[PDB]
Amino acid sequence: NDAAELHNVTTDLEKVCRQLHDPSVGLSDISITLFSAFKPMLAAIADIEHIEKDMKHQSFYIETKLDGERM
DNA sequence: AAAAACTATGCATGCTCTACTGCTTCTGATCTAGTCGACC
Numbered sequence: 001n002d003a004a005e006l007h008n009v010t011t012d013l014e015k016v017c018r019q020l021h022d023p024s025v026g027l028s029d030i031s032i033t034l035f036s037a038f039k040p041m042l043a044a045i046a047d048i049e050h051i052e053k054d055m056k057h058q059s060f061y062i063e064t065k066l067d068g069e070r071m
Numbered sequence: 072a073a074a075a076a077c078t079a080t081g082c083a084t085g086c087t088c089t090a091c092t093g094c095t096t097c098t099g100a101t102c103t104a105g106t107c108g109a110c111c
C-alpha cells in the first residue's frame with residue numbers, strides 16, 4: 001500500500017522489499033532517515049499572472065535560480 | 072740387390088661456430104573516432 005512512499009524516503013529497493021514484505025504488516029511512520037537518499041522536491045511551471053493565487057495571498061520568498069547539480 | 076710394410080702429407084667433405092643481411096611476423100606506443108553515465 002505504501003511502497004512508493006517508503007521507496008521515495010529511502011531510495012533503495014532492497015529495504016522496501018525486506019521491510020514491506022507482509023501485505024498486512026505495514027510501517028507506522030516513514031520519513032527521511034540518515035544515510036538514506038530521498039527524492040528531492042522539484043518545482044512545477046510557474047504562472048506569470050496567478051502567483052498570488054498560487055501563494056494563497058501571503059508573503060513569499062524569491063531567489064535567483066542556480067545552474068549546477070542538485071545534491 | 073730387390074720386394075713389401077710403415078709413415079708423411081694433402082686435398083677434399085661435411086659439420087660447426089660465427090657472423091652478416093634480408094624478409095616475415097609479433098609486440099608495444101601513440102593517435103583518432105566512437106561510446107557510455109551523470110547531470111541539466
Ligand SMILES: *OP(=O)(O)OC[C@H]1O[C@@H](n2cnc3c(N)ncnc32)[C@H](O)[C@@H]1O
Nearest residue numbers: 040041042043063064065066067068070
Ligand atoms: O529545471 P529544473 O526543474 O531541473 O530546475 C529545478 C532544479 O534546480 C534546482 N535548483 C536550482 N537553483 C535552485 C535554488 N536557488 N534553490 C533551490 N533549488 C534550485 C532544484 O533544486 C531542482 O533540482
